[PDB]
């Protein structure tokens, strides 16, 4: 019951998907051949982990997932990799020619050749569900598949599944690892197209993640495998409430209720702690009180925003591991005293907390220390709009001279589609401003 | 006017419903399997009020357990008295209400409400003479709040001449950080003004403050909060459960407590205040039960009764004690604090005395006051509500299920009327 289907679109989407499902397997004691010695309910089950994993006769626990890409290189590595046996081939879907960093190719020219097949396979997963919660969609803002095909799929999923929840994990572009000059363009287009089809979207700023890998893990020049391993921990935190349960556990949909005041204001800010090396973590254990404080240090934010110059509309704390109510309560009391934390006048100021006792694990040869307890804060702050602004400025500079616009028109798009996407983005920044204003 | 049908809806509803049955079962000498093993015969005199009888003279609660997710009911069924309940009287869905009144009252709940009413009907035909129904639920979530008020509106339709009683847990930010609870509560109040005869206003603000201040519990749990509710519910229904003279059925209680059809929101108090750890070796004196049960610290509603005036009061004393002294101390409060009782309802304080005391105490006092100060509670919610509604915040959860802004405006409006009506008679 309450199953959740993950959809991993494009390179970023797929590679992050790898990290995530490896980690989930390590969290639930699932081997790379799908077998799970803990599960005595053979062939079936009602357990918490069954919302992300189906079971088979052989005793094999199978990710409720689909990996889609318009080119086979990245998914091919999955097909041949450590966790090859974990999936069924019908779940790994590849084209031949990618979208060449072109939204238009992803949404139309190449995407249309494969959208039906993907939906057919998504549908086949939905049929295994007693009661589907919704979908999780992992994608890059910048790629052509990540942007264009994702918009197409999301639109198609709105139609085929009506209003079943659709959550995004969107990789926001950073210059230190950008692959295309036109990623601002692709970003604004997918964001606009997906906006009214997405219930809730967790933006991951790569510059933020690159920053944290450099600073807290002393990684000299972070790789994708570096960012992904950190990103996976964060996703794991957010999905923990869906995959585990205990008395103190609060369902993600409950956090969602607090976090989204209006259907367009559905972009929460993630801040995670502790991110700490094994060298620093040795002999130094971090308290409930200590990790809670980190959540309000912008260095630990997942998007480069400044919540201090913005107003709060909500605060959630997703604790996992060795955390007790008593300590959490005292911890928040501190921060209520030691910080200022302005809320808008129309929202209350209570923090919705959830706790999963199941402690964070780490992937072998990871760079992250194996901690006893950890926390992810989900905040709805006006400051998240800063992310749109930086991207909207980058977009503006190029479209002024119609730079690169011709690779898009040639695939079938119009200038009208651009100006339109950009107007939605302007409205969204305006919207994110309107909510910060005080009432009368 | 003999049998009562009990219902409990949602998380809060089922948890306190369960604890309520745990408690009175122990008082009426009924074990988890349903057999009787008690000394006094006062325990079985009006046992037919809340329980049914079966083969082997086992006693089965007249209780219907309702939820939109299986969670709390699975937990209750494997709870202590779990197997005591009629298995068929477990009626649950799987979708949940997501703390949404609209989901509870209009969509996800409508999909289930008929099936519940079937079990209600089956119980009501077993009744030689039905008084009415007592519901236990929170006003802050979705199932108990939304589906609960729907069940009332529907049950009033099949049994309009019966009495509708509720134990309604009012939300507080001190206990819940769900932002929409003031929406859920305002919508529910509108329903309760219209379609209940009696409503016990169990305030989670009060219960938390009581647990933290008086009982010195630094990390109050639901079990702590519910131990207080359990005690109140035992006391308030004592005049119903054992042989007595005053407020001995729901209709009579209503007639004594309700001077005007809408103002039926009661302020419960209790003494001595007890935590599950507290020793309570020293029984209190009758004068101590009295000074406390009128003390704001013992009120379960988080209102200052000195800010308004008592329209009516019931006061129930339990355990072996001087019935002579009970009257003097009772007549003392009335005469000491006479300004706090309305003059235009003579002798508005009525008293009963039951011999059997509550589990673990020798002397207990329960308070039932129809104070005008109850408005402060509704004023509290009203403010938490408008703070959001003026910016139309979080309404999309509700409009998305089919509701309209106008329906909010009217529930806002009808509760503001309620407050003003409670203020009309406070200056009389």
């Amino acid at each position: 019951m309450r199953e959740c289907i993950s959809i991993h679109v494009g390179q970023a989407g797929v590679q992050i998907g790898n990290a995530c499902w490896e980690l989930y397997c390590l969290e639930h004691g699932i081997q790379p051949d799908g077998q799970m010695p803990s599960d005595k309910t053979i062939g079936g089950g009602d357990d918490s982990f069954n919302t992300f994993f189906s079971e088979t006769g052989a005793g094999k626990h199978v990710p409720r997932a689909v990996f889609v890409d318009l080119e086979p290189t990245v998914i091919d590595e999955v097909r041949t990799g450590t966790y090859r046996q974990l999936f069924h081939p019908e779940q790994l879907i590849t084209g031949k020619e990618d979208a060449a960093n072109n939204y238009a190719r992803g949404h139309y020219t190449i995407g249309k050749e494969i959208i039906d097949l993907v939906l057919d396979r998504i549908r086949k997963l939905a049929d295994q569900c007693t009661g589907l919660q919704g979908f999780l969609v992992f994608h890059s803002f910048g790629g052509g598949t990540g942007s264009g095909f994702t918009s197409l799929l999301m639109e198609r999923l709105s139609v085929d599944y009506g209003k079943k929840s659709k959550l995004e994990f969107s990789i926001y572009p950073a210059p230190q690892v950008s692959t295309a000059v036109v990623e601002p363009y692709n970003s604004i287009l997918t964001t606009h197209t997906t906006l009214e089809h997405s219930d809730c979207a967790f933006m991951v700023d790569n510059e933020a993640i690159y920053d944290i890998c450099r600073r807290n893990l002393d990684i000299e020049r972070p790789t994708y495998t570096n960012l992904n391993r950190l990103i996976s921990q964060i996703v794991s935190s957010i999905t923990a409430s869906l995959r585990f349960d205990g008395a103190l556990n609060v369902d993600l949909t409950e956090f969602q209720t607090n976090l989204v005041p209006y259907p367009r204001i559905h972009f929460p800010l993630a801040t995670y702690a502790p991110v700490i090396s094994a060298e620093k973590a040795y002999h130094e254990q971090l308290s409930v009180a200590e990790i809670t404080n980190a959540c309000f240090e912008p260095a630990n934010q997942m998007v480069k925003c400044d919540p201090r110059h913005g107003k709060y509309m909500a605060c959630c704390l997703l604790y996992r591991g060795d955390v007790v109510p008593k300590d959490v309560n005292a911890a928040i009391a501190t921060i209520k005293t030691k910080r200022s934390i302005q809320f808008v006048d129309w929202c209350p100021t209570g923090f919705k907390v959830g706790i999963n006792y199941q402690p964070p694990t780490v992937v072998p040869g990871g760079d992250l220390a194996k901690v006893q307890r950890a926390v992810c804060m989900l905040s709805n702050t006006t400051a998240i709009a800063e992310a749109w602004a930086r991207l909207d400025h980058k977009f503006d500079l190029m479209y002024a001279k119609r730079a690169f616009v011709h690779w898009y028109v040639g695939e079938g798009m119009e200038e009208g589609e651009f100006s339109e996407a950009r107007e939605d983005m302007a409205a969204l920044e305006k919207d994110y401003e309107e909510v910060g204003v005080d009432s009368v | 006017m003999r049998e009562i049908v009990h219902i409990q809806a949602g998380q809060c509803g089922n948890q306190i419903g369960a604890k309520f049955w745990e408690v009175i079962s122990d008082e009426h000498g009924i074990d988890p399997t349903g057999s009787y093993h008690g000394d006094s015969d006062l325990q079985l005199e009006r046992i037919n009020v809340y329980y049914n009888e079966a083969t082997g003279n086992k006693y089965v609660p007249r209780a219907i357990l309702v939820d939109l997710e299986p969670g709390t009911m699975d937990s209750v069924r494997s709870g202590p008295f779990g197997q005591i309940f009629r298995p068929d009287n477990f009626v649950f869905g799987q979708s949940g209400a997501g703390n949404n009144w609209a989901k509870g009252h209009y969509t996800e709940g409508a999909e289930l409400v008929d099936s519940v009413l079937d079990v209600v009907r089956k119980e009501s035909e077993s009744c030689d003479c039905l008084q009415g129904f007592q519901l236990t639920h929170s006003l802050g979530g979705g199932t108990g709040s939304g589906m609960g008020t729907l069940l009332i509106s529907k049950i009033r339709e099949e049994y309009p001449d019966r009495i509708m009683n509720t134990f309604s847990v009012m939300p507080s930010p001190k206990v819940s950080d769900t932002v929409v609870e003031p929406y859920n509560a305002t919508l529910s109040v509108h329903q309760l003004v219209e379609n209940t005869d009696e409503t016990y206003c169990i305030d989670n603000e009060a219960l938390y403050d009581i647990c933290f201040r008086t009982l010195k519990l630094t990390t109050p749990t639901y079990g702590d909060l519910n131990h207080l509710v359990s005690a109140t519910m035992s006391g308030v229904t004592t005049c119903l459960r054992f042989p007595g003279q005053l407020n001995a059925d729901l209709r009579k209680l209503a007639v004594n407590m309700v001077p005007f059809p809408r103002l039926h929101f009661f302020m419960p108090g209790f003494a001595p205040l007890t935590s599950r750890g507290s020793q309570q070796y020293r029984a209190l004196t009758v004068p101590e039960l009295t000074q406390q049960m009128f003390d704001s610290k013992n009120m379960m509603a988080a209102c200052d009764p000195r800010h308004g005036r008592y329209l009516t009061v019931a006061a129930i004393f339990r355990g072996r004690m001087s019935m002579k002294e009970v009257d003097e101390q009772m007549l003392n409060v009335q005469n000491k604090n006479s300004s706090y009782f309305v003059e235009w309802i003579p002798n508005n304080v009525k008293t009963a005395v039951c011999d059997i005391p509550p589990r673990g105490l020798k002397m207990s006092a329960t308070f039932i006051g129809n104070s005008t100060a109850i408005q402060e509670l509704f004023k509290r919610i009203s403010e938490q509500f408008t703070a959001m509604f003026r910016r139309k915040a979080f309404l999309h959860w509700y409009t998305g299920e089919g509701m309209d802004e106008m329906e909010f405006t009217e529930a806002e409006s009808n509760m503001n009327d309620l407050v003003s009506e409670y203020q009309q008679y406070q200056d009389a």
Partner: peptide, 5 residues
């Protein structure tokens, strides 16, 4: 506020 029966 973190508050379990």
């Amino acid at each position: 506020v973190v508050x379990x029966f």
